[PDB]
Amino acid sequence: DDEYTKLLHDGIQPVAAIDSNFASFTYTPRSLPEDDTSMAILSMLQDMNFINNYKIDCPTLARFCLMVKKGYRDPPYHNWMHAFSVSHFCYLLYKNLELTNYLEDIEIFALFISCMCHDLDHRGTNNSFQVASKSVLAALYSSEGSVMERHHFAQAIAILNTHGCNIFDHFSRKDYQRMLDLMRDIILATDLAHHLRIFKDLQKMAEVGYDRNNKQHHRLLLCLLMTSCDLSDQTKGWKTTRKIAELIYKEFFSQGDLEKAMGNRPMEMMDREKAYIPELQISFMEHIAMPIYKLLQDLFPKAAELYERVASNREHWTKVSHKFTIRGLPSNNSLDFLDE
Ligand SMILES: Cc1nc2ccc(C(=O)NCc3ccccc3)cc2n2c(-c3ccccc3)nnc12
Numbered sequence: 001d002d003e004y005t006k007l008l009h010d011g012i013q014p015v016a017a018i019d020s021n022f023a024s025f026t027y028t029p030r031s032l033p034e035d036d037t038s039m040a041i042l043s044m045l046q047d048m049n050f051i052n053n054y055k056i057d058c059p060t061l062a063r064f065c066l067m068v069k070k071g072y073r074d075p076p077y078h079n080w081m082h083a084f085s086v087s088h089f090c091y092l093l094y095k096n097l098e099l100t101n102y103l104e105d106i107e108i109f110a111l112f113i114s115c116m117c118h119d120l121d122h123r124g125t126n127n128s129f130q131v132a133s134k135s136v137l138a139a140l141y142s143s144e145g146s147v148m149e150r151h152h153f154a155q156a157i158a159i160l161n162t163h164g165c166n167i168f169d170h171f172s173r174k175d176y177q178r179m180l181d182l183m184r185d186i187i188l189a190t191d192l193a194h195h196l197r198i199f200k201d202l203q204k205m206a207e208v209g210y211d212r213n214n215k216q217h218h219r220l221l222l223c224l225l226m227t228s229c230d231l232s233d234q235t236k237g238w239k240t241t242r243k244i245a246e247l248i249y250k251e252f253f254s255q256g257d258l259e260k261a262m263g264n265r266p267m268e269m270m271d272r273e274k275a276y277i278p279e280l281q282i283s284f285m286e287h288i289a290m291p292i293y294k295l296l297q298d299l300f301p302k303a304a305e306l307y308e309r310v311a312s313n314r315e316h317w318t319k320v321s322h323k324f325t326i327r328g329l330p331s332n333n334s335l336d337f338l339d340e
């Protein structure tokens with residue numbers, strides 16, 4: 001209760017008081033210490049005027065925010081700080097790219113809340129592993145796909161249906177249903193499999209030009225912005241990309257270890273013996289990350305800097321790829337590592 005007490009009664013700090021650069025793309029939200037992140041969630045909500053506009057109950061909101069935070073486990077990458085930094089990028093798009101000209105207020109509110117909840121209760125493993133290991137989640141959800149993402153959605157709903165946690169309690173039936181509909185759509189788009197299916201449609205949308213009167217264009221745009229948030233670590237400095245590669249490949253390799261204890265051949269990228277991290281990083285950037293921010297740039301001309309930094313961070317990887325080949329002796333002055 002003490003964290004809840006202080007988060008509820010101390011008041012909401014202004015976004016500038018968190019960091020002077022808080023509303024800028026150049027700022028890295030991972031540098032904020034975890035114990036401050038719940039306050040920063042409230043301050044962003046305050047600053048986007050969602051608390052006032054939707055008359056969100058503050059006691060309810062405090063509990064909800066902490067419940068979402070304590071709904072994340074602690075694998076190398078898919079932990080609370082990922083959700084937080086993903087939500088922050090959603091805040092950055094609101095401040096810097098004028099989402100109100102494209103999207104309804106409620107759709108913008110949904111995206112931000114979806115960002116907070118999109119990876120709840122993740123276990124450092126992807127959808128394929130759920131079927132392979134025959135986990136509880138596959139048993140539930142494998143027949144429509146997007147296993148983890150459906151679980152992510154279900155967990156967020158469980159948080160809403162916990163007593164005193166339903167930040168939308170006072171919404172009309174029609175607003176409540178719209179908000180949960182949005183959360184379904186938005187969270188399921190976090191499966192990169194989904195993104196790859198809607199990619200042609202996203203290109204179509206960019207070519208012809210955005211149409212605020214077109215209901216499909218809203219749905220498509222909402223998906224693109226979610227993925228943009230989900231991969232937003234790539235739009236920062238080189239250093240952030242470096243660290244995030246380290247965290248995800250730790251997570252991934254751990255899965256591989258389990259897969260081959262269960263007698264399966266992991267996919268190259270899960271395999272610590274086979275995975276060449278430089279080619280995999282560049283490949284993810286080229287085929288997945290870069291074209292997303294290209295499309296984001298195509299729809300928002302003010303999002304050019306984001307594509308530019310991802311493109312530059314890709315160049316940075318190619319330049320450092322040679323450090324993965326050992327020259328001379330490895331500073332041990334030993335070649336004991338070869339006895340196998
Ligand atoms: C840095 C990085 N590399 C990834 C490499 C590889 C992958 C990854 O899952 N690739 C395989 C894949 C691609 C397309 C569709 C289905 C499966 C993800 C990476 N990633 C993410 C991420 C992970 C899971 C879900 C959503 C996003 N976020 N950052 C990364």
Ligand SMILES: [Mg+2]
Nearest residue numbers: 118119190191
């Ligand atoms: Mg996910």
Ligand SMILES: [Zn+2]
Nearest residue numbers: 118119190230
């Ligand atoms: Zn994610």
